[PDB]
Design an enzyme around this catalytic site. Sequence first.
Site, PDB file in Angstrom:
ATOM      1  N   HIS A 197       2.344-198.061  58.711  1.00 27.89           N
ATOM      2  CA  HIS A 197       2.163-196.864  59.541  1.00 27.89           C
ATOM      3  C   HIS A 197       0.689-196.684  59.959  1.00 27.89           C
ATOM      4  CE1 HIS A 197       6.145-194.560  58.317  1.00 27.89           C
ATOM      5  NE2 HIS A 197       6.366-195.583  59.127  1.00 27.89           N
ATOM      6  N   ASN A 209       6.660-190.541  60.228  1.00 29.09           N
ATOM      7  CA  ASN A 209       6.660-191.890  60.825  1.00 29.09           C
ATOM      8  C   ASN A 209       6.183-191.781  62.270  1.00 29.09           C
ATOM      9  OD1 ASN A 209       9.309-190.970  59.473  1.00 29.09           O
ATOM     10  ND2 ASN A 209       9.346-193.175  58.855  1.00 29.09           N
TER      11      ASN A 209
HETATM   12  C1  LIG Z   1       8.809-203.534  59.566  1.00 32.20           C
HETATM   13  C2  LIG Z   1       9.213-202.048  59.583  1.00 32.20           C
HETATM   14  C3  LIG Z   1       8.617-201.149  60.496  1.00 32.20           C
HETATM   15  C4  LIG Z   1       9.041-199.794  60.481  1.00 32.20           C
HETATM   16  C5  LIG Z   1      10.046-199.374  59.606  1.00 32.20           C
HETATM   17  C6  LIG Z   1      10.614-200.276  58.718  1.00 32.20           C
HETATM   18  C7  LIG Z   1      10.194-201.595  58.695  1.00 32.20           C
HETATM   19  C8  LIG Z   1      10.894-202.516  57.668  1.00 32.20           C
HETATM   20  N1  LIG Z   1      10.524-198.099  59.642  1.00 32.20           N
HETATM   21  C9  LIG Z   1      10.077-197.208  60.585  1.00 32.20           C
HETATM   22  C10 LIG Z   1      10.632-195.915  60.754  1.00 32.20           C
HETATM   23  O1  LIG Z   1      11.610-195.560  60.080  1.00 32.20           O
HETATM   24  N2  LIG Z   1      10.078-195.019  61.693  1.00 32.20           N
HETATM   25  C11 LIG Z   1       8.990-195.386  62.485  1.00 32.20           C
HETATM   26  O2  LIG Z   1       8.484-194.606  63.297  1.00 32.20           O
HETATM   27  N3  LIG Z   1       8.442-196.646  62.312  1.00 32.20           N
HETATM   28  C12 LIG Z   1       8.996-197.557  61.406  1.00 32.20           C
HETATM   29  N4  LIG Z   1       8.451-198.810  61.330  1.00 32.20           N
HETATM   30  C13 LIG Z   1       7.240-199.099  62.146  1.00 32.20           C
HETATM   31  C14 LIG Z   1       7.646-199.293  63.611  1.00 32.20           C
HETATM   32  O3  LIG Z   1       8.541-200.401  63.678  1.00 32.20           O
HETATM   33  C15 LIG Z   1       6.391-199.522  64.463  1.00 32.20           C
HETATM   34  O4  LIG Z   1       5.568-198.338  64.411  1.00 32.20           O
HETATM   35  C16 LIG Z   1       6.721-199.747  65.938  1.00 32.20           C
HETATM   36  O5  LIG Z   1       7.558-200.910  66.130  1.00 32.20           O
HETATM   37  C17 LIG Z   1       5.395-199.917  66.703  1.00 32.20           C
HETATM   38  O6  LIG Z   1       5.707-200.275  68.040  1.00 32.20           O
HETATM   39  P1  LIG Z   1       4.749-201.126  68.971  1.00 32.20           P
HETATM   40  O7  LIG Z   1       5.477-201.394  70.295  1.00 32.20           O
HETATM   41  O8  LIG Z   1       3.471-200.345  69.221  1.00 32.20           O
HETATM   42  O9  LIG Z   1       4.356-202.551  68.233  1.00 32.20           O
HETATM   43  P2  LIG Z   1       5.340-203.645  67.654  1.00 32.20           P
HETATM   44  O10 LIG Z   1       6.738-203.194  67.322  1.00 32.20           O
HETATM   45  O11 LIG Z   1       4.578-204.215  66.427  1.00 32.20           O
HETATM   46  O12 LIG Z   1       5.376-204.693  68.825  1.00 32.20           O
HETATM   47  C18 LIG Z   1       4.195-205.354  69.306  1.00 32.20           C
HETATM   48  C19 LIG Z   1       4.647-206.657  69.956  1.00 32.20           C
HETATM   49  O13 LIG Z   1       3.407-207.233  70.457  1.00 32.20           O
HETATM   50  C20 LIG Z   1       3.505-208.673  70.319  1.00 32.20           C
HETATM   51  N5  LIG Z   1       2.124-209.235  70.283  1.00 32.20           N
HETATM   52  C21 LIG Z   1       1.213-209.106  69.282  1.00 32.20           C
HETATM   53  N6  LIG Z   1       0.098-209.733  69.643  1.00 32.20           N
HETATM   54  C22 LIG Z   1       0.268-210.247  70.843  1.00 32.20           C
HETATM   55  C23 LIG Z   1      -0.562-210.997  71.680  1.00 32.20           C
HETATM   56  N7  LIG Z   1      -1.810-211.324  71.306  1.00 32.20           N
HETATM   57  N8  LIG Z   1      -0.066-211.423  72.853  1.00 32.20           N
HETATM   58  C24 LIG Z   1       1.181-211.101  73.229  1.00 32.20           C
HETATM   59  N9  LIG Z   1       1.996-210.376  72.446  1.00 32.20           N
HETATM   60  C25 LIG Z   1       1.558-209.945  71.252  1.00 32.20           C
HETATM   61  C26 LIG Z   1       4.282-208.857  68.998  1.00 32.20           C
HETATM   62  O14 LIG Z   1       4.957-210.123  68.989  1.00 32.20           O
HETATM   63  C27 LIG Z   1       5.263-207.660  68.955  1.00 32.20           C
HETATM   64  O15 LIG Z   1       6.589-207.977  69.414  1.00 32.20           O
END
Ligand SMILES: *Cc1cc2c(cc1C)nc1c(=O)[nH]c(=O)nc-1n2C[C@H](O)[C@H](O)[C@H](O)COP(=O)(O)OP(=O)(O)OC[C@H]1O[C@@H](n2cnc3c(N)ncnc32)[C@H](O)[C@@H]1O
EC number: 1.1.3.10
Lengths: 85, 85, 577, 577
Positions: free
Chosen positions: C506, C551
């Site tokens: 988080h 969250n």
């Molecule tokens: C793992 C997890 C997370 C989680 C959770 C339970 C688990 C087991 N429970 C949650 C909950 O009940 N309520 C909540 O609000 N959040 C919960 N979380 C966290 C939540 O999943 C994250 O806050 C949310 O997914 C954040 O979203 P965001 O869109 O900002 O980021 P992401 O999901 O991490 O996706 C980012 C994507 O970007 C790609 N990436 C990374 N680096 C690069 C580069 N350099 N170039 C191109 N793409 C990139 C990643 O691959 C990813 O798909």
Amino acid sequence: VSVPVNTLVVDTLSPTSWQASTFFVRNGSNPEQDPLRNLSGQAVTRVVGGMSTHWTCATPRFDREQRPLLVKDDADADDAEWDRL
Amino acid sequence: FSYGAVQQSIDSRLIVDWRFFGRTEPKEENKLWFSDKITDAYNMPQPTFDFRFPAGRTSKEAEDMMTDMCVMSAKIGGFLPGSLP
Amino acid sequence: MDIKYDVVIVGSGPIGCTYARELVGAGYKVAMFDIGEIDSGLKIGAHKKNTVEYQKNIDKFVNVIQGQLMSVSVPVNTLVVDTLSPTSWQASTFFVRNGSNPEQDPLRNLSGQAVTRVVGGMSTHWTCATPRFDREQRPLLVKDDADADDAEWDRLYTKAESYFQTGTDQFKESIRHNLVLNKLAEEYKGQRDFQQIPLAATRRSPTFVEWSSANTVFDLQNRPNTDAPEERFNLFPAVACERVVRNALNSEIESLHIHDLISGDRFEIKADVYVLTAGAVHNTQLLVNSGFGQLGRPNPTNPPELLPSLGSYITEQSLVFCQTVMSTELIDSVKSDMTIRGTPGELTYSVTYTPGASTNKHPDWWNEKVKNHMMQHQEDPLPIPFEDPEPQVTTLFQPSHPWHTQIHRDAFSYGAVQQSIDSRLIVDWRFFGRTEPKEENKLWFSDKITDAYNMPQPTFDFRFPAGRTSKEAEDMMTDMCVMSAKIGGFLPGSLPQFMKPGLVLHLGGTHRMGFDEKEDNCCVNTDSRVFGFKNLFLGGCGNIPTAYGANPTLTAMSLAIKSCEYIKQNFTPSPFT
Amino acid sequence: MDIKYDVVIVGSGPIGCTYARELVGAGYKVAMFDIGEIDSGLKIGAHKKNTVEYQKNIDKFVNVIQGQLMSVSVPVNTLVVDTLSPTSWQASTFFVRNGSNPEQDPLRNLSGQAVTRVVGGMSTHWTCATPRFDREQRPLLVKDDADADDAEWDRLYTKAESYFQTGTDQFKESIRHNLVLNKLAEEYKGQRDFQQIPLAATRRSPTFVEWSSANTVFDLQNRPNTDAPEERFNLFPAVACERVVRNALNSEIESLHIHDLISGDRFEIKADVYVLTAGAVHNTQLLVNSGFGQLGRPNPTNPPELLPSLGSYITEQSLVFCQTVMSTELIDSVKSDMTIRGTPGELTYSVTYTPGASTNKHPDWWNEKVKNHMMQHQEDPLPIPFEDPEPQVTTLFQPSHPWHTQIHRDAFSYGAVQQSIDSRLIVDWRFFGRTEPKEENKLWFSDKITDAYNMPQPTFDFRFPAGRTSKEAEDMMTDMCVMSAKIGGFLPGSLPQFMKPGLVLHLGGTHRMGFDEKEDNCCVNTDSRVFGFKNLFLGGCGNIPTAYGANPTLTAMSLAIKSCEYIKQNFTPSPFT
Ligand SMILES: *Cc1cc2c(cc1C)nc1c(=O)[nH]c(=O)nc-1n2C[C@H](O)[C@H](O)[C@H](O)COP(=O)(O)OP(=O)(O)OC[C@H]1O[C@@H](n2cnc3c(N)ncnc32)[C@H](O)[C@@H]1O
Ligand SMILES: *Cc1cc2c(cc1C)nc1c(=O)[nH]c(=O)nc-1n2C[C@H](O)[C@H](O)[C@H](O)COP(=O)(O)OP(=O)(O)OC[C@H]1O[C@@H](n2cnc3c(N)ncnc32)[C@H](O)[C@@H]1O
Ligand SMILES: *Cc1cc2c(cc1C)nc1c(=O)[nH]c(=O)nc-1n2C[C@H](O)[C@H](O)[C@H](O)COP(=O)(O)OP(=O)(O)OC[C@H]1O[C@@H](n2cnc3c(N)ncnc32)[C@H](O)[C@@H]1O
């Protein structure tokens, strides 16, 4: 004091090793013992001095609420007796 | 007791033990009995327990006691990992 | 792939998909890049838990989660293994091994911090809890008018809840949910309220829930297509986005450097608008790699001139966890309306209730379920039906209890061996603390060490701040111990404990929002626009500048909506051509 | 979905896809059903390890494997948990909990046996080792002519190797592969040969291998499509196949009952030809549910009249495992051609070799890699380059060593914490025993208990047979201990051990092949046709009737090819319409 019959499954023995068909009485287990109605932690000490050879030495008095009566119908007399002892 | 078999990584001067001890209502159903067939290592009748913590005051107090240790210990420090409540 | 788009979005998580949903729908020509690949089936970026098989084997989904959490910064391992054979090659020192980061102080880490690189990001595995922040946890969108600020957040959260399909009713007929929620409700003497965790999810049947994800927000299919013939969208998976190119004035982004991980080739993409939604860690990495902030170990002697607050004031929540085994008192209450005679399995055994009896503590629907279970399954000693859905209970953050709570059953921490304790008895407790933003708490990137994608290696310099944050974390632990006791004793092997720092996932404040770059020590304004830049926007929890326990994703989404409104107000889509 | 096909195939594993590849290509109208769903990305049924991210984080793929291995039969749990709070509800007996099978004797189980329900089956996660069986391990396809039998198997294996893209060259430039293979080769004094494990895989780059899977065999896209406009194929995921309907004479199958897990509706599908490729366990389940063999606990008093050998003579391999830490002797040999002067990290330090020197033990390519690593990474004490591919070594089963061997690095058993021992030092050892088929060894199905799909609950009655099979298993353990010692000592935490029975996932003989139903105690003939039935065929390792130590899938595939040839010889495809 009382160890129940062990029921852990060990199924990673070599095929050549002798292997039980049942959970039989082994290693000093007590077949009378229900493992779910035990004091599994209960233990005894057989050495001269008994458990006082290893104990923590905490010797608090019991207040009335925890304590058997030595005098039946007189709490002051009961207190005096316990205080003296 | 409960030093266990490997060295604490946490400095000993920081560590404090908490042991809270409950009172148990005497109940007729809670027994220590001895087998008429099985014997212990001294060829004496094998001790067997038929014990459960009584359901009402004794159990309610035990759980309140756990909570009390959690509340009180917090005033001193957080729990030591591997020695959780 | 074209070389020119109206809008480029880096990352296909739920926040990236918020920008796509808004901007693709508004007629922009949009490209989206993800370093990760299409995983979840034909529904692109969908929740991996939404298979029939996982919902029949929910104990297995913990492995899916662990299999896509890649540790952010692992310190040099110092475990002594002195039981090697004398013939085995043996180290003379604790050298850098197995992807360890030699920059990392193991005692100032978020060792639990992890990232997920798959299309849909972490929303392919998440728990789906989407609470709103109350004022105390929430950044200001309007500076000097709390009512106007409330209205703005209400409008944005309402839309975000629509995007996620947030609901609070999906578990209402669960006996276990009821048992827990009713007991807690009656014990807090009107001073704390309990409700269902708001969940981004739609129940499809008594035993299946369609959990929401990135895909729910935007289906990620290329456009034009038959369902949207006048929209323009392309998703490019397995593309590492590496740098944005600043102009000299730091007033515009002129290009995005990308690396195709399949061909190996590198390209540059031009857009009118650049949106970074790569996650709290990876947004910050991409920006430092682009010359924002400071590469390398921080020094006060020489603080950065471009976005000096980037990677400082980072926050992560303290997280405490246990499980309980339901009390005899609660199990007995399930069957309190039943007349029970004889012994289970014997000819004379019976379990009956009087439908509609005013002395009944439960409605007919409950008593029906319970009677039938007890009579049809006399080999079973519990009154709870086998397929009863899990509890999903919370008391939300308040001043008198400043932590979020989830009293529930999470797919995580099932572990590798079968519970000997009946599952219907087990309840998870997770309390989540808020962390004060402090300048000394940093996410920085090595000028020498690189990660598996040849990008500057993330390194944490983090401690939970000593005063309010620490006092609250410990009070929060106590609060979980007190509250959980009303439901049952702790489950051995799941005793009350703090989780590894950052395992909670988080993390916020890495590229934080405020009104004024200098006065509010921040990186983006309330449109999520990077200060000084006309066309660079950041999305995600890295924007949240406050101490929050709830969250963060719904809040991050709401900010993303507000950001998209700014884009719609200031950039013209290109002609459809 | 139509109600009528030429051929229906139950299961989309690599064996189901063998039938599809053969029969779709031959112009049949084919339907394929899988109880599992499309998982692996847009390449349907592809290997989940084929993401850029997994191959950069190979330690994480163990979780993907564990997350899709659902235990076949779990006995009633008898662990005593007596540290519950007195308020917690507590069992008076060890009752059936948490999906345990009360039919299962925990001491006659294959506790490690698991199944995978996703499109592509277990080929979405498998190790890809595809050795051939030598005569001693192999069923006869020709009865009285070993040369003709050899020719037949050579032709079928050659085609199967083409389908899987089996190769033995993908790891030839690995220093670690070489180090291990060369040492073992020189120590066995010409009496055992070492080669690369034959792997179904194609190397794409120095750091990426495209592992083969069901998708490699048949891409699973619906047809007609642009690439195959005259082919006819439909895949239906999330469809539980529940029964085939026999006629009275047991000479034909007249229908397949299916259950759509999304809508819940049930349907019946008609085909000319029915092919069951649901796996060794689930083929047997589907057949017992259809009235073959005997439902319920076996009894000799009353043996089944239809396919009496079904579910008897089951075989599973004993599997022993350890890891080693490479010897100082071997690490030193990597750099044996180098002149090394001074101390790493000091100004005068140097590492040089003479290109082409006849006294050199390694070719220039090796010495180049080693010198550059040693000079560029003076902080690192090992001479092996960081991205050096893993070892993939075997000595194949022979009479004098009747077990298969893999000396390698498997994605499995990485476990949950980081190795403190450098990965370049670690080598896995897995030796696989052959098990004598015995009538008493059974897979049977409860007449009362059902699994999560409401099908009769699988139950094992299995012990490794007492004589040759057990003697060999223990000699095999010793052989791994002796052989591994030549490479390095055991890695603490991975000491030599037998794995949980069935974790090896090489179960065979559940629906075994032979020439004569009665004389050979079997279920299908050498065309994989069920005895007595014109139009029912079984595919998979359940067909293998012999004691085999090598990995069975390539052999199962070869049998499937032979089966498809029979179908092509005896069934006419319908007109394209
Ligand atoms: C793992 C997890 C997370 C989680 C959770 C339970 C688990 C087991 N429970 C949650 C909950 O009940 N309520 C909540 O609000 N959040 C919960 N979380 C966290 C939540 O999943 C994250 O806050 C949310 O997914 C954040 O979203 P965001 O869109 O900002 O980021 P992401 O999901 O991490 O996706 C980012 C994507 O970007 C790609 N990436 C990374 N680096 C690069 C580069 N350099 N170039 C191109 N793409 C990139 C990643 O691959 C990813 O798909
Ligand atoms: C083990 C222990 C005990 C303990 C403690 C800490 C530990 C680690 N801390 C204590 C504390 O802080 N405060 C306190 O009040 N008690 C604490 N204890 C328990 C305490 O040691 C016992 O309550 C106490 O020792 C009881 O005394 P008692 O004299 O009644 O019994 P004993 O010490 O167990 O000695 C009995 C002796 O009898 C001999 N024996 C047993 N059977 C026979 C037969 N059949 N024939 C002849 N002799 C027999 C035993 O060998 C023993 O020496
Ligand atoms: C898990 C595993 C397996 C494995 C391995 C490593 C791991 C971690 N390494 C191997 C190796 O190196 N070499 C080798 O030869 N085998 C290896 N294996 C085992 C291998 O994966 C299996 O032998 C092979 O996949 C067997 O193929 P098959 O096509 O016969 O069966 P399947 O892969 O299990 O697929 C069956 C499909 O059927 C569906 N199903 C099951 N029941 C039904 C019903 N009732 N209705 C409809 N469909 C059904 C399953 O969902 C599955 O997809």
